[PDB]
C-alpha cells in the first residue's frame, strides 16, 4: 500500500495473508467471507507467464494478522486449504478480466477480536454505494513504493497498511490506460490536483476494497485488488474486481 | 501480476528508426527484444532487459518472516497439562524432526503446543 | 440486513458479517472511517 498508514489492531478482521510455505513469502492478500471461505484474486493463484499454478499443498492462509513478519501466537490463525476455485473465464492473457478465486479452508476457523468475516454486497448495497467520489478502503502488506534504488527491503511495511480511496467514474478510468476495461472492473484513486495520493501495490493483490454502509453500519467488500499501472503514478488508477458483478459465480461455487 | 502494461503487445509504432528495446512476452514469459521505431507504441517498452524484468517478471520478495522461539516454542517435549480434556495438539519433536500429535488437557503445558500440523511446521521447521 | 448464502455450505458468520469486534461492536469509530462518511456528502 502506497501513501497509507499503519492499520489499527482489528481494523480489518477479515484481512487474510496468502502465504507460500516453501520459499516463505507473502504471495497475496485475501479476505474472510465466512468461517470457511476466503476470497482472493485469480492471478494470485494462476499466472502462466510466471509459470504460476499454486495447489493447496503450496499454500497457507494466515488470518488475524497485524505484523507482516511476527508470529502472532494466540491471535493469528494459520490454516491449510481444502479446495481452490478459479473463475473459468479468467482472462489472464489480456486484462485479468474476472480476477476472482475462492479458497475453501480445510477446517472452519473460530472467530475473535481479530478474525471476523466481511459482508458481500447485495443489489441495493451495490447501487447505493458504487458512486463516483465515494471512498472505499484498501488494506495489505505489499510494497510501500513502486520502485527502490538498492533493495526491495526499503519498501516493506512492518505492519498492515490502510488507505482510503475514492471510486472513479468509467470515462476517467478508461482514458488512464491502454488496457481494455470490463464491467467486471472498477477503478479507484485520486486524480491529479486533488492533492491526495494512495494506491495498492505489488503484494496487495487479492486484498479487499471495502466500504462501510451508512444504512446498516456493516462493511461490504466491493472489490478485490486486481491490477494497475505502476503504483501511485499521477494520471493512473488501481483496478479492482467488481465483486457484486461476479456474485452469481460466488454463489454457484459455494452451493 | 499487477502491471497491466506487461500484457500489451509489442508495438513498434509507425516511425522508421530501429531502436533495440525490450517487451514482456506473455506466451513465453520472457523479456524479449524488438525494434522500436522511436515514436508512440506502449508502456511494454524497456531500454534494458533488467528494467523489463523488474517491471514485468516475477518480483524480488522478502523472506524475513519470524518463526517460533525455538527454545521455548519447539524444543520442549510434549506436555498434557493438569486438566482432563482430550484435545489433539501438535508439537515439534526435536529427535524426529517432525511435528507430531499429542493429547492435551486444556490447561498448563508449554508453548510447543499447536492446533494444526501446518502451524507447527511453519513456526518450528524454519529458522 | 439479512444473509444471502446457505449456511450449510457457506458455514457460519454471514449474519454477523461486517461488524468488527473492536470497533462497531463497542461503538468505537476507527481513525479514518469519518473520511469515508464525509465522501458520501461529497460524491455523486
Ligand atoms: Na495515482
Numbering used by the authors:
A (entry chain B): 16 to 36, 36A, 37 to 60, 60A, 60B, 60C, 60D, 60E, ...
B (entry chain E): 16 to 142
C (entry chain A): 1P, 1O, 1N, 1M, 1L, 1K, 1J, 1I, ...
Please quote the authors directly.
However, the crystal structure of the bovine thrombin·boophilin complex, refined at 2.35 Å resolution, reveals a non-canonical, ornithodorin-like binding mode; the reactive-site loop of the N-terminal domain remains thus freely accessible to a second trypsin-like proteinase. The complex crystallises as a dimer in the asymmetric unit. The two complexes are virtually identical (r.m.s.d. of 0.58 Å for 419 equivalent Cα positions), thus only complex A (thrombin chains A and B and boophilin chain E) will be described. By contrast to the major rearrangements of loops surrounding the active site centre observed in the (E192Q)thrombin·BPTI complex, the structure of thrombin is virtually unaltered upon boophilin binding. The experimental electron-density map unambiguously shows that the N-terminal residues of boophilin bind across thrombin's active site cleft in a parallel, hirudin-like manner. The most relevant feature of active site interactions is the occupancy of thrombin's S1 subsite by the ideally suited side chain of BR17. The guanidinium group of this boophilin residue forms two hydrogen bonds with the carboxyl group of TD189 (3.4 and 3.6 Å) at the bottom of the S1 pocket. The only other major contact between the proteinase moiety and the N-terminal domain of boophilin is the parallel stacking of the side-chain of BF39 with those of TP60C and TW60D. The C-terminal domain of boophilin engages in both hydrophobic and electrostatic interactions with thrombin's exosite I. In contrast to the thrombin·ornithodorin complex, however, where direct interactions between side chains of the proteinase and the inhibitor dominate at this interface, in the boophilin complex the equivalent residues are mostly involved in water-mediated interactions. We conclude that the N-terminal boophilin domain can simultaneously engage thrombin through its N-terminal peptide, and a second trypsin-like serine proteinase in a canonical manner.
